[PDB]
Amino acid sequence: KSTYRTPNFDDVLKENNDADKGRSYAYFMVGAMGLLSSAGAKSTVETFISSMTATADVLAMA
Amino acid sequence: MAFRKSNVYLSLVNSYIIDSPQPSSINYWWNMGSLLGLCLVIQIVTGIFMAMHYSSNIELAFSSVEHIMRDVHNGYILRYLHANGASFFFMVMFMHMAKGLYYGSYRSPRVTLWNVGVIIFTLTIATAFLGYCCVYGQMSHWGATVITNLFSAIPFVGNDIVSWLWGGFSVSNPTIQRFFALHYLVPFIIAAMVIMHLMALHIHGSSNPLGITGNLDRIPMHSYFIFKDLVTVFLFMLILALFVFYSPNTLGHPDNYIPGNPLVTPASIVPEWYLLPFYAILRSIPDKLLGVITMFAAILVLLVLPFTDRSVVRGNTFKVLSKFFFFIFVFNFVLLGQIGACHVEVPYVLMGQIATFIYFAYFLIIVPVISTIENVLFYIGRVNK
Amino acid sequence: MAFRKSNVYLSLVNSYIIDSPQPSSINYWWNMGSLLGLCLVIQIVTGIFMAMHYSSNIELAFSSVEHIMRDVHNGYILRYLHANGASFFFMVMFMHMAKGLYYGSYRSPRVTLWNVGVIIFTLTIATAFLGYCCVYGQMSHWGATVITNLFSAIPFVGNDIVSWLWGGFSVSNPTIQRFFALHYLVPFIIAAMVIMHLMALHIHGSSNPLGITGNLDRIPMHSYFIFKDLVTVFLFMLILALFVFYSPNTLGHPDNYIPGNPLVTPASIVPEWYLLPFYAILRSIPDKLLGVITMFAAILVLLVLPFTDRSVVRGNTFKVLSKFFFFIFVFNFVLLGQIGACHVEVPYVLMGQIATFIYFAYFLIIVPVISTIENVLFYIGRVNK
Amino acid sequence: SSLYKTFFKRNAVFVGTIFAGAFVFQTVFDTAITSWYENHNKGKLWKDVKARIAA
């Protein structure tokens, strides 16, 4: 076969009438994963940091 | 060159995590190792924050853990993460090991990689036992008693080792204070052994599911397997979260919510689930010395597999008899654990003794015989003279 | 090739300890680094064995250390090794740093090496403070109080940091239990930083007393410097032994044999000797915020020396003015420490403020001016036009 | 989708916007969940029991 004759990718290629379809989907997904991760990391860090604050049993009102 | 390459610290990161050439075809079974590193981090971080609130004195240890549960903000989350994480650490380790078994990862040139792995496994088992003792519930006290007594089986100087390990006449304050100190230490030795594990991994690279060379088609770690790792990291966290928040005590033992009592061993005593197969193996031998020898040998026999696997191809993917007997091994191992959870009673004692035999026979007999037969079958099926 | 080269683990040992090419002319001042590794090992080993007997509860901590002194076989040896070893660790660190200062070891291409060193120094100071608090004598309690309060000087959110560090209203049980947990951790982070220190050392090798290239005449680490290291290892042990057995409390403070008392600060309170120069610097500034800023800056200003040393040759060996002012710096540093040990009284307050100025002026003013002058003197003394 | 190309316009979302959105999410999400949770458990809460006691 001739290397200039590119194999068929038609089953995979998005029939491009909308150019930035996959880009907008990918960047939304990547953006949303970034959002929920940062909120998750923030909550995880606060959980640990707050375990070092005064314990419920040592807050005595003398 | 790029800074990630030229800098002394970053180049380590680059060669292990970014540009590291991976075989294109490794499947999700190769995600377990990163999950083990993650587990190691979860155990260390949650343990240090708990240590801040923990007292190792035998009078105070159980109450100091109740104090973490009740008074420390998010304390129950730390404790339940640690306890359930230890279990998840073993689930994933068994899968990592089973993966290695199936795909011939223990084979040359990765024998050193495998041997260091077996050391990590022993260290991880010892670390979890030390931690379990620190709670000082009923299972803690008698676990400490039974396991330190393993060494009394040693000829002549055995009871001397035990009293030295105890720091006195029985499992007491000296014992629990030194077991906490040791529980803190060994995770860091495991960390150093993991680095040695990754060093041996790096010089030959990962294997792959076909069992053949990966040299003809590599893709970089970065992007492809970084984000593929992320998929199983989140699935792992999801499931660990379901236990920690919704079912935090399902993988433990109710007797360890009872303070340890030196005068009473509960009838309901059962080892931690991840120790059950090994427990069963020991219990199957009606002799003290030989019971503890056979149990230790059940771990060391993992070292024998590079020599008893006689096959000429790496891994079980294209091997009909080896696949079948591999799953005999796995389900035999589950049975050993179900026997461990049972009473020393009629059908169970014999089943455990036969399952014990099957366990050892796999490495020493089945694999060498079957892999030889498969060698010959592959040959006479294609050669015409 | 030889096995020590071909094996994955041994080759690390070979390239760092056996075949590592050393400049032929390095003198005994280059023995301090191995003595620091030895110190780190002594502190970790003796600390772990003591941890086995130590209780971190604020009610029990002081008595648990008396228990190590009285009841633990060879317990007084462990405690005195640890306490005196911490001091010896600082003596040797100051000498290692002073060596670096004198011979221009901070210079390019060893800037990264120097910067990692400054981090280790900060970590080592924090580690010793955490350990000192664990005794919970009088000096422990007020040391913990004064030093955690350093952070109260931080704008707006400072008192919040302090109450978070304390775990309550004042230095109490939460505080001492978390300081023990942290004291156990940080030595292992120091160990990881030492590895990063040796990594940066390895790519450029050691400097030497002439300040010029070592590339024309190397001799292997093994034999020559292994046995040369041994000479100072034994001398170090001899002297440490004289203190541990014959004078074990000469480098400490009698007030720390009194249990901590939250209501009474002794009139005789004095910081540990190795913290005195820095203490004096803080005490010289009659403002809270600026006192703690200037003291921290006295450590960070070490980072500035690669930029303010304008000379065109590495090291002070052939530099008459630089040698003189180097020893002004050293003896000025000793004075700062002698001021720290004194009362806040007339002559001393002014002397401390002037010595503080001299300390900073050395890095920021004297070295840039003098090294420029020496540059020009070297030139006009040989050029005839 | 063209909802993306109005806000971010064929470019990826930047860390600053991500971090900012996360702070917003944290508060909104917490209130939404606490609300659903307390409602789902109406009758059983201490809030609800205190409405039937007075002394």
Add this chain to the structure above:
Amino acid sequence: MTAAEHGLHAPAYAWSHNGPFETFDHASIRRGYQVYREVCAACHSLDRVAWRTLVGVSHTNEEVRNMAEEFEYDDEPDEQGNPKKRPGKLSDYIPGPYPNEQAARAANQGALPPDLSLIVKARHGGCDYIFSLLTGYPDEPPAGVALPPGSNYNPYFPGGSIAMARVLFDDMVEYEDGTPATTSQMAKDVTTFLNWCAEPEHDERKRLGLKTVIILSSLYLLSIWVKKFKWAGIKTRKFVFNPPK
């Protein structure tokens, strides 16, 4: 092992706190405290529960203060060093009936009534077990069973022979909220109260879990999508071989 030695399997009752979205019923907790105070506390300590934890859970700040002050606790010695006592405060732990173990065994035929702070977590079966035990004393033991003197029969206890007699009987308690104090109602209530004692973080823990599981679920589904995108070039890659001359 024989069924008697194992003990009868406790059945699954429909507790209102069972289920991932379910809080405790706090009215049942309130009632359960009364049953504990008026029946159980005569033999059973509750050492790990401090008065303050009741506030906002089952009682008001004022109610708990009155309850704590009904008890005397050791105080700091006076100016001269003689011991002295003190009414209880919210920082104190709920006091037990006996001063030491030996005094507790003396009052119970030599048996030791366990502390109940953790009892729900320290037994297989949890709430189902505790409830079933309390409501499962038969008027007479099954035929042939020879009970030791001072022992009682209960099929749910391992071995059948338990040193605690039945103590719940209809209307032995006057519920402050009007509820008919039947034995199964009182059992249901203390047991709910004892689950809270053992798991005070229950309601909050499940609320946090709901958030954690939603975020992690989303992150999981999201990462799958992102992985597939990042792999699409490799997965649909195509090779051709033209053997070299």
Add this chain to the structure above:
Amino acid sequence: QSFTSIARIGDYILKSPVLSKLCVPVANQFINLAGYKKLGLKFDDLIAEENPIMQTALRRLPEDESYARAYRIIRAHQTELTHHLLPRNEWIKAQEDVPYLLPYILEAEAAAKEKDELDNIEVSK
């Protein structure tokens, strides 16, 4: 296990028409169940190569077979990662599943065995 040893046992079976008619059908069915032909591989492509015998052998392989092995291996990895098998018309047929590397392996094992024999020869006077 050496290929010299597999060849010894295998050839003994292949000649004696008692065993030959008994085993080869079993072996044929084992090979089909193995499945490697559905990935486009020949058995000899499957031999673990990280040892000196196999490196000697692969070194000695003629160019055209070498390029062909390379394609079959790359094509196998790509198909494996897509969780498919090849189109059936692309499978390796039994006529193609030849021991192409075997003669080079056996040759190298014999050379190696002789060196080991000669390095350890005793002498008698």
Add this chain to the structure above:
Amino acid sequence: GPPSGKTYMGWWGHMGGPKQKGITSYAVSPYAQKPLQGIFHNAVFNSFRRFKSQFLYVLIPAGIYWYWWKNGNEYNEFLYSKAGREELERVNV
């Protein structure tokens, strides 16, 4: 630098594979490809394949062990019931 043991993997540009010639590969940007609503219709009758080959290797050992477990358990139950206390006396010690 410090020397090095010969291995069976190199790095980019010298991986240690055989010389490759004649193989030509093609690929297409993920950006240019159909957003992930494809799989299904084309790929769900496809997969669920790789476990038709495998399920017997798992299921038959699983079956053997589950049967063996259920049997031993039901036997233990019989032994400790009334009906079996005679057999219990026989098989015990």
